Write an enzyme that holds these catalytic residues in place. Sequence first.
Site, PDB file in Angstrom:
ATOM      1  N   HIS A   1      -3.236  -3.036   7.798  1.00 15.65           N
ATOM      2  CA  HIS A   1      -4.259  -3.325   6.816  1.00 15.65           C
ATOM      3  C   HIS A   1      -4.794  -1.983   6.291  1.00 15.65           C
ATOM      4  CE1 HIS A   1      -8.283  -4.615   5.373  1.00 15.65           C
ATOM      5  NE2 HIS A   1      -8.743  -3.739   6.286  1.00 15.65           N
ATOM      6  N   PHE A   2      -5.042  -1.932   4.999  1.00 18.03           N
ATOM      7  CA  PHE A   2      -5.703  -0.782   4.386  1.00 18.03           C
ATOM      8  C   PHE A   2      -7.170  -1.094   4.277  1.00 18.03           C
ATOM      9  CE2 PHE A   2      -5.285   3.174   2.193  1.00 18.03           C
ATOM     10  CZ  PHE A   2      -6.511   3.251   1.541  1.00 18.03           C
ATOM     11  N   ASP A   3      -7.993  -0.308   4.964  1.00 16.21           N
ATOM     12  CA  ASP A   3      -9.432  -0.613   5.006  1.00 16.21           C
ATOM     13  C   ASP A   3     -10.220   0.113   3.930  1.00 16.21           C
ATOM     14  OD1 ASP A   3     -11.121  -2.442   6.535  1.00 16.21           O
ATOM     15  OD2 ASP A   3     -12.297  -0.636   7.058  1.00 16.21           O
TER      16      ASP A   3
ATOM     17  N   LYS B   1      -4.734  -9.888  -7.527  1.00 10.35           N
ATOM     18  CA  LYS B   1      -5.424  -9.240  -6.410  1.00 10.35           C
ATOM     19  C   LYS B   1      -6.529  -8.350  -6.976  1.00 10.35           C
ATOM     20  CE  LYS B   1      -4.174  -6.851  -2.079  1.00 10.35           C
ATOM     21  NZ  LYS B   1      -5.183  -5.748  -1.995  1.00 10.35           N
TER      22      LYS B   1
ATOM     23  N   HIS C   1       0.766  -1.232   0.000  1.00  6.41           N
ATOM     24  CA  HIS C   1       0.000   0.000   0.000  1.00  6.41           C
ATOM     25  C   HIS C   1       0.792   1.273   0.000  1.00  6.41           C
ATOM     26  CE1 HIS C   1      -3.573  -2.340   0.365  1.00  6.41           C
ATOM     27  NE2 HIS C   1      -3.120  -2.948   1.449  1.00  6.41           N
TER      28      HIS C   1
END
Length: 124
Positions: A119-121, A41, A12
């Site tokens: 984590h990228f939400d 992905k 990210h």
Amino acid sequence: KETAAAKFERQHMDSSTSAASSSNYCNQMMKSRNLTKDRCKPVNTFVHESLADVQAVCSQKNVACKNGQTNCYQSYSTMSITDCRETGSSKYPNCAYKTTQANKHIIVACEGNPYVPVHFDASV
């Protein structure tokens, strides 16, 4: 094995560019960051900011993650991001993506000591 913090950086972060420079940004970056190695992905966001500025989001506005976890945080400021999502023609191993530029707040989940993104939400 790769830490969750390190996987966040690999998936990210793009502190090397200020925005996506062409329609091929996602195709190139998804490949280079090994996000197409085993499967395409489907969706991924890159953040064009310093690492410290993104890590600092872990001390910004707490909000529950999509999945209900309470260790998410929204950035106070907008950030330069690139949204990558598969094109209709994407077909492993020839993964293909639409690159979209934006300036959005980010929401990340954080863990650890130091307390950093894992984590990228969402972009919002």
